[PDB]
Every structure is written in C-alpha cells, then in structure tokens.
C-alpha cells in the first residue's frame, strides 16, 4: 500500500473539501443542521467509493459506516470533522482520512476547507502542510506551553467535573494557554505545525486521531496513551505533545475518564 | 468625526496586519516572544501617529500608550489582539482600532491578519467583512447555542475556581459547544458574522470590545453588561449574544469576578 492510494487520498481530500467549502454559503436553526449531515454523507460517499473503486480489497472505516483494524490495510476516515462548528458556520471544519497497513499507521491526510490548508504525512517521509515542511514545535516546559484539547459531547454531570478539573490543572502548572478550537483534527494539526504544544481528550475517536499521528509523528511530536508509553487506538483517548518530556509531563498532571 | 478617519483606520488595519503577517515566518523558545512585542509596538506606533498625524487633536488609547474616555474624538486601540497565539505562529491574531465620538462608539475595524478577513463596522450603516454585509445569528435558545469565550492571565487559585465553574454553568444547559481560540476581538466579530451565537469574558479590557461593539451591533447582535442592562466599557466585563433574550439568558446563568 504506497502512493496511488496517497495521490488518490489527497485528491479525494481536495475535492471532499470544495464541495463542502461551497456549502457553507447557507442561508434556518436546523435546516442547516441537515445540510450538514446531508454533505457528511456526500463526503463519506464520496471518499469511502472513490478508494473502493480503486482497490476494491481494502478496509474502511468512519463516523457513519465499530471501530475493529485488521492487518489489511484498512483506511480509516472523517468525512468531516467539526460538525458543529459548520452547523454554525465556524471556519473550522476538516476532512481527514487515514491509511494504515499491517495494522500501524502509514499515511494521512488532514484538509481545511475554509483556510485551504493541505496537512499530509506517510511514514518515513515527514509531514507537510501546503507543501511546506512541518516540524514539530520543541518545546518542554509546560509553563512556556499553548495547550490544545476539545470538549465532548457526553452531557453528564460526572463527565463535566473531571474535564473541568482537568482543564484547571494544566492550568494551574504555567501554561501559557488552552485552546478549544472545536476540532481534534486541525487541533492535533496545528501542533504538528508548531502552532501548539500539547493536546489532549478522552471521548475521542480512532478516525480522529488515525491521519494526525502520522503527521504529528514524522513533524517530530509524540502520541501516546493518557497513562503513558503506548498508544492505543481502539481506546477513545489521546495525549500528544511537542516533545517526548512535555508528553510525560502532561500525564503525570491529568486524571483518566471515558466511554 | 467621519470618513476620513475610517478610511485611514481602514488603510493602516491592513499595513497594520500585513507587517504583522510577515512576521509570523519566523523561527528560538524566547526571542519569539521579543519579535512579537517589537511588532506590537511597531505596529502601535505606525497606527497612533498616522492617526495623530492627520487629525492632530484626536485623543488615544491602547495596549501600551488608564482607560479614561472623554467626550472627545478618541481612537480606542488594540495594536495586536493575541500576543500569545502570535508568540506560537497560531494562526489568529487581530489588529483592533475603534473609534468613539461624544463618549459613544461611532465605528470599528478589526482584521484577521493571517485569514486576511476584514470586519468593519459604522453606527447607522450596518457591520461588513471583506464588503459582505455581516448578520448576528438570530438565535435565542442556549441548547441551540455555540458560545466563546477566553481565558484570562490572571492565574490566581480564586479567579480559576470562577471561570471554571462558570463555562460549567453554560454547559449544563444545553449549549452545543465553548470555544476557546485565544482571541476576543475576532471571537466577537464571529458573533458578529453569525458563526457564533453568544460571547463573554471578566478581566477584558475597553480597547477590546470597543470595536467588536459597534460592529456586532450593526449586525444585529446585543453587547452588555454581565449584569445585564447597560454595557459599562471602563469596566473589565461583557456580554454580548446573538439576541437580546440570549444576552439576558447566559446573564441569570453567570457569576462575577474581576479585577
Ligand atoms: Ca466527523
Ligand atoms: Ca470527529
Ligand atoms: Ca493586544
Ligand atoms: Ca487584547
């Protein structure tokens, strides 16, 4: 699995980013609403067949069509991620799909629609934006760091006061910020760039997470498990930093609660 | 107090947001943050001298150069809105510069340097953005709404406990979602546009919500105080919504701390 599924990917990411681009200029408290998900499944469609027409053998994955990754390479997706912020219009919504083979990572492809920026990355080869080299911030200290991480959708009293809680302590150590832009994808992107330092979230998801690895990897970053060490996919969480230390340090100063 | 004071406010936003723009190709933990102070007060000076330049009689108001308004013509200013987010080449800082007459607002622009999109805003002529007549979103129901809002730098163990548990507050309802992107100008002029249905913060400052008010008001938007009623601008406080019954709806929803 190499670059004719790349090529195809970021062509398919392009194209899934115009048409969705071209939707925002609407005009309505939930006929948007629809519009939305209407344009989700047009993206979806249109990525999850494209690729199947073109090696017919492969594996998918997405928001609409559990989250189980076979040894086969398998493409995992998010037809669009932010659906909230684009029921609003909030220039801030992302079309992300992910391949990995022999069951690890091998490229993905993160696009924004508003902004136009192009955020790609296999493995071994780096990660771009626009085609412009990505590096990953190099920071360490918490206290020189812009903290990014998103709120879920889990409504429920007990959730609420350990996102809260959690929030204050990166808080309460000297970081400089925390930044809830209302998407992982361009969220785990921007530190990718170096545009931020250290992201979090429990209630995420695979297909979230899945593409930015990738790029937040061969940028330099780190990704792994809430806990420590490893990184596991199948779980709804994530911690990836600027650095191996900052990553440790965001742990050792976070408390565990999902599904 | 005009035209020809607009059409400069205008002329310098966007020197005042193209030099600030090139500035953030650079590349290195603290002489950032220098760069960014450097442009902040090149950019300060370029605006209160062209502007004292013409109209020599003009009083002013900014970041650097108390906020005490008289009946005056006086400029009210925010050379670089997200000093932070420029220290870390985050893709969302503003220029601000409002105009007040007879101690009210009598219009604003506010720029998005990196997005290159342009707010704008006169009293009796309506809000635009890049000439697009701007709209508020005309919601009223917080379960239907996306609120914003910042942090504050005052990292004080008592201010915390607030913030908190105020986002909290808007998140027990039913509020879709709180957005953090480390701005209050251009999160006011999202409200404005209708990208955002309601806005708030303690520990702001007057040459921040000097222009966004204007604008989000020739929107359509209601800007207040967290109070409710009036909108006191040498206080540190505000609250403005998509609608008059937002407004007054996330005000018997909040607690206040200040200063
Ligand atoms: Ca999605
Ligand atoms: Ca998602
Ligand atoms: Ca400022
Ligand atoms: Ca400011």
Redesign the interface.
Same mark, same amino acid.
């Given at each position: 699995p190499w670059e004719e599924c790349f090529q195809a990917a970021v062509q398919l990411a392009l194209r899934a980013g115009q048409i969705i681009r071209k939707a925002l200029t609407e005009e309505t408290?939930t006929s948007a609403a629809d519009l939305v998900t209407e344009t989700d499944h047009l993206v979806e469609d249109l990525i999850i067949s494209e690729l199947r027409e073109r090696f017919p053998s492969h594996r998918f994955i997405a928001e609409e069509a559990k989250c189980v990754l076979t040894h086969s390479p398998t493409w995992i997706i998010d037809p669009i991620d932010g659906t909230?912020?684009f *029921? $609003?219009?909030?220039?801030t919504v992302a079309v992300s799909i992910g391949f990995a083979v022999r069951q690890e990572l091998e490229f993905g492809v993160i696009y924004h629609c508003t902004?136009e920026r192009l955020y790609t990355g296999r493995r071994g080869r780096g990660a771009f934006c626009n085609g412009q080299r990505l590096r990953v911030?190099g920071?360490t200290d918490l206290s %020189?760091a812009?903290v990014l991480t998103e /709120?879920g959708p889990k @409504?429920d009293?007990a959730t609420?006061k350990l996102f809260?809680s959690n929030?204050?302590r990166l808080?309460?150590a %000297?970081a $400089? +910020? *925390? @930044? *809830? /832009? +209302?998407s992982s994808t361009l969220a785990l992107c $921007?530190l990718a760039? +170096?545009?931020?330092?250290a992201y979090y979230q429990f209630g995420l998801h695979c297909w979230d997470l899945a593409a930015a690895t990738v790029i937040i990897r061969e940028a330099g970053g780190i990704v792994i498990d809430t806990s420590g060490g490893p990184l596991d996919l199948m779980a709804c969480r994530v911690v990836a930093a600027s650095t191996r230390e900052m990553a440790m340090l965001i742990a050792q100063a976070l408390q565990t609660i999902n599904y």
């Open positions: 408290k909230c912020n *029921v $609003h219009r909030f220039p902004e911030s920071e %020189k812009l /709120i @409504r009293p609420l809260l929030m204050e808080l309460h %000297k $400089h +910020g *925390v @930044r *809830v /832009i +209302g $921007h760039s +170096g545009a931020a330092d």
